[PDB]
Structure 1
Amino acid sequence: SGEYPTVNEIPVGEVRLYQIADGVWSHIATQSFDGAVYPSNGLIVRDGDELLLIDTAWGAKNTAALLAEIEKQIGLPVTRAVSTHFHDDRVGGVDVLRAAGVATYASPSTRRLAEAEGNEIPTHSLEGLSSSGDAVRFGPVELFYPGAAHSTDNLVVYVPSANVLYGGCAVHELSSTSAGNVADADLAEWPTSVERIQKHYPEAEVVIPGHGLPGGLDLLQHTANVVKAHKN
């Protein structure tokens, strides 16, 4: 009924949308992994009479439910998707998207890592993002590679029309007391990567983490803080 939806409020297999700004939504779904249930976010950005999707809903059936929820609530077609790193909460569901006719994209790094992991693989490579600090336009968003953080390949997404910064899994929510799933992280580089984000997007008004509640720019420093406390 209005607040941002949390893990215990979303059965696995259901998807919620949350309006962030004019023409910008997050999507929220839950999934079981190693015997625990976690929420995760993605983004939807209106692209004229089409939609750009950022990240899957963490699984095939969740991603099918995402497409159905989009049709119910927005009623515009998803024509392109970008996955912001290679983990299943970002690419799991790409095959569903691809068969629905959505053109799926990720950096070459992400595609390689997804393939090596046995995860689903976006179709098209996003060039121009291989060096930290790189930025490219993609429809109504800018894609930015901040450097290694939560993963070596993680991308962030900015929506200039709305000053929305989607940090993906490189950015943690304010309530987080840990650094999440760090199996593929670079904890030593992560704070430098966050600094690059902070410097590049000083006008961001909303910051959306890969998991949990959006907030403001404080999420960026908080992320550096929780990573530093994990590394220590």
Structure 2
Amino acid sequence: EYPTVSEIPVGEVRLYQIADGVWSHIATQSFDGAVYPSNGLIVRDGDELLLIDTAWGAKNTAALLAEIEKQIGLPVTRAVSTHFHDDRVGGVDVLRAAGVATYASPSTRRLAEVEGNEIPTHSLEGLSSSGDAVRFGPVELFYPGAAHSTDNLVVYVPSASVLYGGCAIYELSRTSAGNVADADLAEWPTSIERIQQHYPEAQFVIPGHGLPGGLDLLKHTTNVVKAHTNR
């Protein structure tokens, strides 16, 4: 049922409804000779929508907005990017031109500037220490510590028990580590443990790339990271 990388042409975006007022968005991109899928989230906020992450580039993000209008028909008023890589912030300028207020932590904004990626306009305060959580409308934002990147955030939707792990959480089909150039391998398992301790009630866990599962995705990611550490 959930769309896989093999079913989505690059340039098109699919929506997958998880619960009342909660969807993921799925897009694909060519990178380094291969095609990869990528996930983000959409959460209803009264008569408006909160977006988590772009759809990996300007063209995909324009298609994302069009697919939201077609399938949901409510305006995206705010967006949060969960780390500084281009699959999370590429398309921010499209969002801004459409009137969306774009947000990220100060860490993420700094790292995006250094890398030359697009920079969300607004700053999320209260997330600079491991274990910090803040409310953002219908979600909670959580900084678990450094993992896939030093700035990575996770997002929890309490009304639906949906945990969006972003790129700090791997899908089951990925059995070897991905791009870890910006990672903190030594801390990544401890950061995952903070996620488990804070959201032990989660029922639906979404990785940054690939198929959702349950909290077993956390143990899976720990296994893969530790195997890479022991290479």
Q: Is the TM-score greater than 0.5?
A: yes
CA distance, structure 2, for counterparts of residue 218 and residue 112 of structure 1: 33
CA offset digits 1:97-150 (Å, max 9, x no partner): 000000000000000000000000000010100000000000100000000000
CA offset digits 1:188-232 (Å, max 9, x no partner): 100000000000000000000000000101001111110001111
- The TM-score with structure 2 as length reference comes to 0.99
The corresponding residue for 1:30 is 28
RMSD of aligned residue pairs (Cα, Å): 0.6
* 1:120 maps onto 2:118 in alignment: yes
The corresponding residue for 1:213 is 211
Q: Secondary structure at 1:173's aligned position in 2?
A: coil
Identity among equivalent positions (%) equals: 94
Deviation at 1:67, TM superposition (A): 0.2
Q: Choose 90-99 or 172-181, whichever is displaced more.
A: 172-181
Q: Secondary structure at 1:197's aligned position in 2?
A: helix
Kindly tell me the number of residue pairs found equivalent between the two proteins.
Answer: 230
CA distance, structure 1, for counterparts of residue 18 and residue 212 of structure 2: 9
The corresponding residue for 1:137 is 135
Deviation at 1:21, TM superposition (A): 1.2
CA distance, structure 2, for counterparts of residue 114 and residue 18 of structure 1: 28
Deviation at 1:179, TM superposition (A): 1.9
CA offset digits 1:154-210 (Å, max 9, x no partner): 000000011100000001111211122111111110000000000000000000000
Q: Choose 61-70 or 30-39, whichever is displaced more.
A: 30-39
Unaligned runs of 5+ in 1: none
Q: Secondary structure at 2:172's aligned position in 1?
A: coil
Deviation at 1:35, TM superposition (A): 2.1
Q: Secondary structure at 1:116's aligned position in 2?
A: helix
CA offset digits 1:61-89 (Å, max 9, x no partner): 00000000000000000000000000000
Q: Choose 152-161 or 26-35, whichever is displaced more.
A: 26-35
Which of 21, 31, 38 is 2:19 aligned to? 21
The corresponding residue for 1:151 is 149
Extract structure 1 runs of 4+ deviating beyond 2 A: none
CA distance, structure 1, for counterparts of residue 18 and residue 185 of structure 2: 30
The corresponding residue for 1:170 is 168
CA distance, structure 2, for counterparts of residue 175 and residue 123 of structure 1: 35
